[PDB]
Amino acid sequence: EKRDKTYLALNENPFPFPEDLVDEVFRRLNSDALRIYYDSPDEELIEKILSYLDTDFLSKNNVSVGNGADEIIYVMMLMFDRSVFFPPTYSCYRIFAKAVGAKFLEVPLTKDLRIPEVNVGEGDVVFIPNPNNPTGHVFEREEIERILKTGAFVALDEAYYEFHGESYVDFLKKYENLAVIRTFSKAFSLAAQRVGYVVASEKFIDAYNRVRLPFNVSYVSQMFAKVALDHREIFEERTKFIVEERERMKSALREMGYRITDSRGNFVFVFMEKEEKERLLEHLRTKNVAVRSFREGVRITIGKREENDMILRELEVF
Amino acid sequence: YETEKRDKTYLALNENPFPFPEDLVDEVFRRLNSDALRIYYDSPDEELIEKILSYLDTDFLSKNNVSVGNGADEIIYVMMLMFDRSVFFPPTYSCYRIFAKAVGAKFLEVPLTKDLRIPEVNVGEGDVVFIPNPNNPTGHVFEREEIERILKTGAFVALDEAYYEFHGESYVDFLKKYENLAVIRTFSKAFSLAAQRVGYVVASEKFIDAYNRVRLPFNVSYVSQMFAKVALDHREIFEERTKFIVEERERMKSALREMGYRITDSRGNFVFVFMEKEEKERLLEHLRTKNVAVRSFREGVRITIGKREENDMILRELEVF
Numbered sequence: 001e002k003r004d005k006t007y008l009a010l011n012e013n014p015f016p017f018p019e020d021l022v023d024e025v026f027r028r029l030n031s032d033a034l035r036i037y038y039d040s041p042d043e044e045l046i047e048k049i050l051s052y053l054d055t056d057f058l059s060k061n062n063v064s065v066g067n068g069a070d071e072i073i074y075v076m077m078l079m080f081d082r083s084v085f086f087p088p089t090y091s092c093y094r095i096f097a098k099a100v101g102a103k104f105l106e107v108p109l110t111k112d113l114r115i116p117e118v119n120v121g122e123g124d125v126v127f128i129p130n131p132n133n134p135t136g137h138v139f140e141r142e143e144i145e146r147i148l149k150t151g152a153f154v155a156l157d158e159a160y161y162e163f164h165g166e167s168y169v170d171f172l173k174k175y176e177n178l179a180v181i182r183t184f185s186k187a188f189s190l191a192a193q194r195v196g197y198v199v200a201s202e203k204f205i206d207a208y209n210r211v212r213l214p215f216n217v218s219y220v221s222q223m224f225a226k227v228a229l230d231h232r233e234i235f236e237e238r239t240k241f242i243v244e245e246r247e248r249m250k251s252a253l254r255e256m257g258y259r260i261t262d263s264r265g266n267f268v269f270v271f272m273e274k275e276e277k278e279r280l281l282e283h284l285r286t287k288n289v290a291v292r293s294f295r296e297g298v299r300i301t302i303g304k305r306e307e308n309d310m311i312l313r314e315l316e317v318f
Numbered sequence: 319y320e321t322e323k324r325d326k327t328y329l330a331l332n333e334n335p336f337p338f339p340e341d342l343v344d345e346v347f348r349r350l351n352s353d354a355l356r357i358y359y360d361s362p363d364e365e366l367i368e369k370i371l372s373y374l375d376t377d378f379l380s381k382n383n384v385s386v387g388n389g390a391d392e393i394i395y396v397m398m399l400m401f402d403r404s405v406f407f408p409p410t411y412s413c414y415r416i417f418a419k420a421v422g423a424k425f426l427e428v429p430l431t432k433d434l435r436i437p438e439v440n441v442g443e444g445d446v447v448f449i450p451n452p453n454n455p456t457g458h459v460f461e462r463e464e465i466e467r468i469l470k471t472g473a474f475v476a477l478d479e480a481y482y483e484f485h486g487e488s489y490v491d492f493l494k495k496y497e498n499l500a501v502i503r504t505f506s507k508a509f510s511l512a513a514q515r516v517g518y519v520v521a522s523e524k525f526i527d528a529y530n531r532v533r534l535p536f537n538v539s540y541v542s543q544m545f546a547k548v549a550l551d552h553r554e555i556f557e558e559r560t561k562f563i564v565e566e567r568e569r570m571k572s573a574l575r576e577m578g579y580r581i582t583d584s585r586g587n588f589v590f591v592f593m594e595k596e597e598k599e600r601l602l603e604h605l606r607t608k609n610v611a612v613r614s615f616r617e618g619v620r621i622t623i624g625k626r627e628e629n630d631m632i633l634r635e636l637e638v639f
Contacts, residue, residue, distance in 0.1 A: 010358055017355035026347055032337035034545075035510035037321060067388050070534050078421060092535075099532040100399060189356035192540035211420045213391050214320070214413070219513035220541045224355075 002290075006310065008301035009292040011133070011160075011267050013189040015238050017224070021231055025223045038219040040212075041065040041197075045222050048229045049197055053169060061202045062172070064209055067216040068194035069159055069183035070096075073127070075212045076155055076179075077102040080125035086116055088294065090133050090157065113261070115143045120150025122177070129157035131164050134292060134299035136263025144168060153177040160265035162187035162239050163246070169199060176201040186266055188228045188235050193221040242266050246302045252312050270315075271297035280318050287314055323611050327631065329622035330613040332454075332481075332588050334510040335563070336625075338545070339555055346544040359540040361530070362386040362518075366543045369550045370518055378494055382523040385530055388537040389515035390480050390504040391417070394448065396533045397476055397500075398423040401446035407436060409615060411454045411478065434458045434582075436468065443472035443498070450478035452485050455613065455620040457584025465489060475499045481586035483508035483560045484567070490520055497522040507587060509549045509556055514542045563587050563623050570623065573633050591636070592618040601639060608635065 046063050053063075066072040074096050077083045082103040085093040097104040107116040113135055115128070126147055130139045147154050148171065158180055161167045169180045179200035185191035195217060198208065228235065250268055253260050261269040273280075277298055284291060289310065292299040300311055323330065367384050374384075387393040395417050398404045403424040406414045410430075418425040428439050434456055441447055447468055451460050469475050469492070479501055482488050490501050500521035506512035516538055519529060549556070570589055574581050582590045593601060602614060610631070613620040621632055 012358065013356050015356065016353035019352050022347070022350065022352055022355075026343065029343070030337070031340050031343045034338035034343070034513045035334045035336065036512060037331055037333065038513040039319070039321065067534065068536055070536065074534055096534075185358075191357055192355045192359040192536075194536055194539050213388065213395060215391070215515055216388060218515050218539055218542050220545075221539050 004288045006288050006303070006307055007290045008267075008303050008307060008311070009290050009299075010191075011186055011265065011301050012191055013186055013238065013266065014242070014303045014307070015189055017189045017228075018231070018234060021224075021227045021234075025220070025227050028227070029220060029223055033219055037215055038222070040215050040217055042222050042226070045226055048226055052229055052232070053199065055169065057173060058199065061205060063197060063199050064205045064212075065217050066196045066198065066212060069157070069181055069185060069196035070194075071212065071216060072181045072196055072198045072208075073155075073157070074100065075208065076125055077104075079207065079211050080153065081123040083125050083127065084118075084152075085127040088132075088134055088296065089127065090129050093127050113137050115139065115146065120147070120152050122151040122153070124152045125155055126152055127155050127157055129159065130168070131160045131264040133157075133160070133265070134267075134269055134294050135261040136160070136265040136267055136269050136299070137261050138164060138264050141168075144171070148175050148178060151177065153179070156180045159183050159186060162236075163243060163266045164264040172199065172201070176203065179204060184225055184228060187239055188225075189238075190221075190224050190228060193218075193224050195221050195225045242302050245305065245308055249302075249308055249312055253315070256312070256316050258315075267292075267299055267301045269297055269299045273297065280315075283318060284314060289314065325609045325611045327608075327610040327624070327628055329588075329624050329628065329632070330611045330620075332507060332586065332620075332622045333512055334507060334559065334587070335623065335628070336510055336559055338510045338549075339552070342548055342552060342555075345548045346541065349548075350541065350544060354540050358536050359543070361533075361535055361537065363543045363547065366547050367518075369547055373550055373553065374490060374520065376490065379490075379520065380523075382526060383493065383520060385519045385526045385533075386538050386543075387517050387519065387533060389506060389512075390478070390502055390517035391515075392533065392537060393502050393517050393519050394476070394478070395421060396529065397446055397448075398425075399532055400528060401474060402444045404446050404448060405439060405441050405473070406448040409453075409455055409617065410448070411450050411480075414448050436460060436464050438467075441468060441471055441473040443474075446474040446476055448476045448478060450480060451489070452481040452584070452586040454480070454586070455588070455615050456582045456590050457481070457586040457588060457620075458582050459485060459487075459585050462489070466492075469496055469499060472498065476502060478502045480504050480507060483556075484564050484587045485585040493520065493522065497524065500525055505546050505549060508560055509546075510559075511545055511549060514539075514545050516542050516546045566626065566629055567623050570621075570629055570633065574636065577633075577637055579636065588620050588622045590615075590618060590620050597639070601636070604639075605635060610635070 046060050077097050077100050083097045084105045086109045087106050107118050158167050171178050181198045183196040259271045263269050398418050398421045404418050405426045407428050407430045504517040580592045
């Protein structure tokens with residue numbers, strides 16, 4: 001419960017799915033297909049995905065799909081002896097591994113938000129959300145190779161790719177124990193239609209395809225992803241801003257005297273308080289505002305310009 | 319890719335013979351709020367699960383005894399993740415063994431009697447016995463006492479009612495006495511909505527409680543629920559398609575019996591015809607010859623009920639044998 005319009009606690013894109021494309025979806029959907037068991041990754045869908053990644057080596061067999069980016073996570077943890085992530089990370093990593101009955105190990109990130117040091121090992125799968133959530137910061141070239149080199153299978157959660165220039169999807173030219181997970185939930189405003197895709201070695205995809213549900217991505221959902229991909233410039237325009245807006249109020253918070261993460265996502269992270277923030281959380285609530293409460297600060301999602309200025313205003317009267 | 323078999327006449331996946339009501343498609347997109355797509359729509363819809371109850375038509379069931387999944391499959395899937403051991407009896411739904419392995423759960427397969435009866439297996443609490451009913455692929459129906467038996471052992475019963483619409487009854491009114499039971503349904507067969515993956519679980523508030531704690535939070539898409547919702551608000555249309563199919567079935571069974579074939583009392587949207595291998599295969603290559611696909615099983619073939627003209631065709635072929 002509770003969403004009284006001004007909600008910035010789930011990294012949801014502020015803009016609704018373009019009405020235009022909504023009309024192009026079923027002006028393309030056959031009412032006769034709805035009755036059969038529609039091919040999970042659509043042969044067309046993958047092709048358009050390949051173009052999106054715009055690489056010169058991967059093919060059809062290096063890409064698969066999942067009911068939201070969540071399913072890829074959920075299933076991977078089922079196919080590895082142990083899942084290891086580094087808090088502060090995606091709160092679900094913990095929830096999922098606990099529901100799957102999987103073996104996991106949480107190792108706190110360094111005070112500098114650097115990757116910790118611990119075991120390694122083939123048979124393990126370590127999740128590295130990059131840019132990280134909720135901090136939003138980015139991991140350096142080396143830190144990822146560090147784990148890759150241990151033999152352990154790394155799972156790069158690049159859900160916030162769009163809001164950050166590059167993605168290490170080129171490590172697939174040199175590593176087989178890697179996988180790049182992504183989604184349309186944030187940059188394409190399709191969070192409601194659950195559509196995610198992973199990218200790895202051919203050995204992993206079918207290995208993956210054998211564990212995931214046979215038909216996990218609906219016919220209609222699959223259309224939205226294709227439609228959205230053929231009008232990506234539209235969304236690549238919505239991003240330019242979210243970034244301009246983000247990196248704008250970041251300077252605004254640094255001004256108000258707040259300590260923030262060098263977030264590179266569709267959100268900003270205001271640090272450290274707790275009973276100061278558990279306080280401002282009470283302040284924002286009487287203002288219908290809603291951010292994401294964490295340990296070591298709160299994470300706020302970049303909404304519309306009015307919502308953005310909102311945050312700053314209410315954040316200075318504190 | 320397993321479904322690479324899509325021929326002019328496909329009756330191998332128990333799919334519905336007609337496309338989703340055209341008009342009804344324009345209604346799901348009529349009440350489709352564009353601003354919802356950008357958000358994480360609530361797992362089950364308050365309205366959706368409101369409708370289901372309506373459908374379920376009962377007095378004891380409440381918004382808490384029901385839940386949804388990405389198609390009946392995910393319900394089975396997560397279920398094998400909750401219990402220590404799953405127990406099913408072949409011939410049964412093929413994905414029970416596939417998912418059990420995939421997920422990595424401990425299973426036990428115990429063959430049904432020669433009379434399609436559930437044998438006595440000392441199962442008990444901690445185990446989850448899957449019992450599709452009507453069964454797949456025989457399509458036969460198990461008796462009250464047959465299920466209530468296992469139920470009294472302590473074991474959990476996953477009564478898969480994926481073919482309820484084609485069979486009058488349902489053991490939903492069992493939750494009144496038992497809690498170690500859960501009924502599973504789907505919109506894929508009766509509502510030509512198999513491409514939108516939507517299913518629902520009916521069980522004790524304590525079970526739904528757990529389940530929801532194991533399934534992905536946002537497993538059913540906004541539009542998917544939308545399709546299920548409008549579909550339910552016009553069930554009438556579908557009730558008719560179901561009427562047709564069962565009639566088209568019983569008709570098909572009688573024609574087959576007369577032809578001297580050994581069939582089952584299928585109460586689903588398909589017919590099962592036993593065939594002694596070396597004669598069965600001739601039939602397959604003969605059908606694959608006439609561009610016809612039917613699911614092949616150990617004891618015979620499962621023929622899905624299609625459009626009037628398709629069924630008539632099937633009857634014509636099985637006659638020349």
